[PDB]
Design a protein around this ligand. Sequence first.
Ligand code: CL
Ligand code: CL
Lengths: 124, 124
Amino acid sequence: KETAAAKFERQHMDSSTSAASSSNYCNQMMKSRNLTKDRCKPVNTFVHESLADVQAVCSQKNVACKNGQTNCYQSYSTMSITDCRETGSSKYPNCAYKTTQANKHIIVACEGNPYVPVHFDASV
Amino acid sequence: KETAAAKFERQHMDSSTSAASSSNYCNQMMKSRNLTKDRCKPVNTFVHESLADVQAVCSQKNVACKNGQTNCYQSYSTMSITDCRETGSSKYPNCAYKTTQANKHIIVACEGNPYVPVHFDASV
Ligand SMILES: [Cl-]
Ligand SMILES: [Cl-]
């Protein structure tokens, strides 16, 4: 079974680009990160910063998570991110995503020792 | 019982300002919109555009909702928004919120006739 930290990395980290460079970024990334296996994951955000920078958010601003838990942290700085969301034309096994690039603060839930990101809560 | 459309308006519309003008905006708005009754609502976004402009999103870009439903729409343009999230010092009945102002696309779930916003899903 995948650890929570490893699942966060697979679903939400893309440090190898500064930004989404085209409308096809999401289609490609959702497939390659194995997020379209038995169904199309409806919504998923990738963060274009180093793993270290994202891990560091866990000691930044403590804020409530949408679900009411208190282990969420908001990045002090904006980060480059890409939101991927299924379009109307999307139908498994032919998943289809809209790619929206933005520079926003991220909010992650953190857990464990080491205390690292385990869920992507939202961007602001 | 409050209708879904009316609840969306109360929780998410603030057309009377162009933007959050101070760190105390959220404390004031969460109280006045009755979002701290029996407990502090952990997270809440206010949109600083006209009601008409937000309603119009329901005929803009159809995208998946985070929960997998297909009745979400992403605004074509960015809008002025303020995210309110409880801080560590927050303890009912003394709720305390961090105010974060941003200009971002909004994503809302729409329902009904008229087909209007009933949930705020996320901002991008
Ligand atoms: Cl996500
Ligand atoms: Cl919200």
